[PDB]
Amino acid sequence: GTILIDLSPDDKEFQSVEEEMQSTVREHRDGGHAGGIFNRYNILKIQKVCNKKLWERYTHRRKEVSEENHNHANERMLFHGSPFVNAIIHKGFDERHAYIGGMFGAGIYFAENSSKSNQYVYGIGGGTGCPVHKDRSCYICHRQLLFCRVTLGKSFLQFSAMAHSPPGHHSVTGRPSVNGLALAEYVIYRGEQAYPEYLITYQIMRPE
């Protein structure tokens, strides 16, 4: 029951989502190995993901968390890149979409840096790159990211360089403690704590 609604580039909503995408690009410690080499994106399309049952599943869980955390859901808008994005927008997030080998355990990971999520579009470590050219830095092929509404509740803070949340917490926050320019990454352990709100289609752009 998912429908996708295209946003106009003239729409303030398109513009605010594009700005969050573009402004959160950073350099990565792999020199571009996983995600490719780029400083900005060519945004091709931004679509709103509308699914009433998935939305109600999200808001139900959001209310439970909020009531466990002094009426504070601690909701964020975060990026998610995955080879499962077409399944996620139709079926919702669930344990099949978790990263079993993640550093905070088997969970569903999200990023503040759009370029961090871009590293995972073609799989863990960028897999083998795009299916057409086998190129992790492909400038031709269209990529997709999700910009998701995420309930963190009481988040366990890890200072750093499906499983359960730590007891007494609803998520984990990975705070960068070496790279002064990296933004945070977050993990949830219940698929109901995220809603895939926007589907963003783009290309990475070759630096000039």
Ligand SMILES: CN1c2ncccc2C(=O)N[C@H]1c1ccc(Cl)cc1Cl
């Ligand atoms: C694991 N990965 C991430 N890790 C840190 C920050 C953000 C992300 C993200 O955007 N995607 C996840 C992810 C990628 C691929 C697969 Cl198969 C599962 C996940 Cl959870």
Ligand SMILES: [Zn+2]
């Ligand atoms: Zn390609």
